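To the team - zinc ion complex, inputs and output below.
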Amino acid sequence: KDQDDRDHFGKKRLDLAGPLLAQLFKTLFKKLTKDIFRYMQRTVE
Amino acid sequence: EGLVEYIDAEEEESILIAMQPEDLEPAEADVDPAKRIRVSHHATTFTHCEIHPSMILGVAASIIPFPDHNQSPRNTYQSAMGKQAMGVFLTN
Amino acid sequence: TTFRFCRDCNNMLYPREDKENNRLLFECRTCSYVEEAGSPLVYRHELITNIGETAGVVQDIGSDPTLPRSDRECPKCHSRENVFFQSQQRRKDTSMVLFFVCLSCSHIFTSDQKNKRTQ
Amino acid sequence: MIVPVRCFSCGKVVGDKWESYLNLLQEDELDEGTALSRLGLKRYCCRRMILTHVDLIEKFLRYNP
Ligand SMILES: [Zn+2]
Ligand SMILES: [Zn+2]
Ligand SMILES: [Zn+2]
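Output:
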């Protein structure tokens, strides 16, 4: 078999508005989840 | 109606495309000297046909008159200058 | 080479010499199993290779549109139906000989005018 | 964006011609070429002036205030 070509355009992908926002959002949401858990600990009700 | 299909660059590897439909689909059994030197339809095995070859180009390249009569990078250059050209950009 | 495995535990068979009767034995190191060697050949190198040229000649080879068709008539069925590839061996050194597969008898024949091949 | 008054090249007053040019094509169902020469546009400098103009003014008017 021939060595794989790293520059075959078919073995590449494009990340448009949606997936770039998906990455960003996930991180931010998880950062609010960690704050929701933090407020819960501080709530000694 | 399955007359047209979506081919990715990976799927492209397993298909055979004719450039022109009419110019690459009949058979044979005088010619204009002015026209460019073209290839045959020796392929029996044609799976797909190119809608129009000029669709290989992007927005910029598509404003170039006769880009097929130019030196390769001269087109590349104009595909930068047309963006730096003035004109109406929106009616508002 | 074509080596065997130890029955009972399907593990690799290693050679052992029976110095008494001066014969080769294939011993198992995953148990007590032994067996006489068929061949006297234990290992083979092969620097110059001739295997990998007729690679992937499945029945559906004639269905591949990406493959070219020719007029070359068949040596056995005599059909002018072909599909040919270059020597499938992916070495730099390789020659550009054609391997024609018939769309009827499904047998392979080359364009080579030097060697009396049978593979 | 509104018909140029005078052809850039030779300065023949192309200004008045517009409305009459549009009317030759629409009404008199004439081809662009014949319509052009009917308005008297003989040289191609004047001819491009009318033939190649894009009346964007009509789009801009569509905006209310
Ligand atoms: Zn064993
Ligand atoms: Zn045959
Ligand atoms: Zn003029």
